[PDB]
Amino acid sequence: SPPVLDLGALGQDFAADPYPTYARLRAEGPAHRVRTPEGNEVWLVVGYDRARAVLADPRFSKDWRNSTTPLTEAEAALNHNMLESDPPRHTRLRKLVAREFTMRRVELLRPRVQEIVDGLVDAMLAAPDGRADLMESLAWPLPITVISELLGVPEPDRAAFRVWTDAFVFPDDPAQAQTAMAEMSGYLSRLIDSKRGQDGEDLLSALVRTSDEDGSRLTSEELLGMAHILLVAGHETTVNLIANGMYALLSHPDQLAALRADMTLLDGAVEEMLRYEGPVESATYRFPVEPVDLDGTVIPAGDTVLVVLADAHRTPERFPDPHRFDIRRDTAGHLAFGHGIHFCIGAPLARLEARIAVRALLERCPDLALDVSPGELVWYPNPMIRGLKALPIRWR
Ligand code: HEM
Ligand code: NA
């Protein structure tokens, strides 16, 4: 049970390029005890077949009642949400919003998502020197705007979320992440109270009435948990898809040129962005309900287990020539949105946002290029998140 590797000790080189580390683990076997840079001891599961199996394996629970790790008040306040639940709670909670997120319902959002991206790109192109940070200009504001509109988060409240997620992803120290959790929990409880009795038609207003009409269908703690998960999971990964995906495309001129020559390759290109540079480096916490033996390594009941999606996607038996970004590759079966009962409910909306943003950038910036050498980029060390601090670009 002591870790074999402290990922914090490896520093920024590991954050920027974690792949050799994970591949070395994979060659030793499927599961490994590590300490993360944040100080948590966890098991990593590596290798595509084992990763896909554990994601779908009901022996691995998502409910903190099966973890041996105790929670703070702030943590406990937010965890009654579907991603941190098992059936039957999972089943009930996801049913409450499944209809909002279907391919057909999401498709009705297209004109508004297009308007948002057109507006943000209009503002970017107005820059004096034909330079911007893609993160600040597009990748961050697009997804927070879309989820905020859907939920009903007023415009001046939205900037706080970048501060909070910065604190959850890359905390200066553990106290800072706890403070941000406490702040966010209080804000969401205020926002829920502010919708009650206001006859709003946004999704948070509907969820507040669902809870008030029957507390057995959605309890007040699950109402706060649902607001939390939809708002945070509903933008944070999309931001990094857009920036990671655009970094990949701009880093590979042959693929960029293939896309420009045939824009019907756009959906496959966004799938290979997910496969090659997806934002979820490792899935969210799983806890074995009983001891689980993975090819002779026994993970104790209750320990925290991270499924390393990033290493599954570089397993060459499953994705041949895995280090090549190839927008024409067969990407079907990637794990970037997970697999099994927790498979991302946001996938149609994430795809719609990322496809619209990538198309608008290529159409509106015919000479788009990176305005930064790779060595000036700064990546997050947390093995759960693959993402950049900034992505400077330039166009004609
Ligand atoms: C490119 C963007 C996205 C990626 C890569 C992504 C990835 C994932 C993954 C890997 C999981 C499952 C995690 C696990 O099993 O541990 C998941 C779950 C989830 N995602 Fe996404 N996501 C994205 C965008 C979105 C959006 C736009 C929404 C807004 C609805 C959203 C809402 C959720 C929620 C609520 C869950 C929990 C589902 C459940 O437990 O049944 N996600 N996402
Ligand atoms: Na990382």
UniProtKB/Swiss-Prot annotation:
Its cofactor is heme. Changing E84Q: Strongly reduces affinity for narbomycin and YC-17. Strongly reduces activity with narbomycin and YC-17. GO terms for biological process: macrolide biosynthetic process. It is an enzyme of class 1 (oxidoreductase). Pfam families: p450 (PF00067). CDD domains: CYP107-like (cd11029). Belongs to the cytochrome P450 family. This is Cytochrome P450 monooxygenase PikC. Its EC number is 1.14.15.33. Keywords: Antibiotic biosynthesis, Heme, Iron, Metal-binding, Monooxygenase, Oxidoreductase.
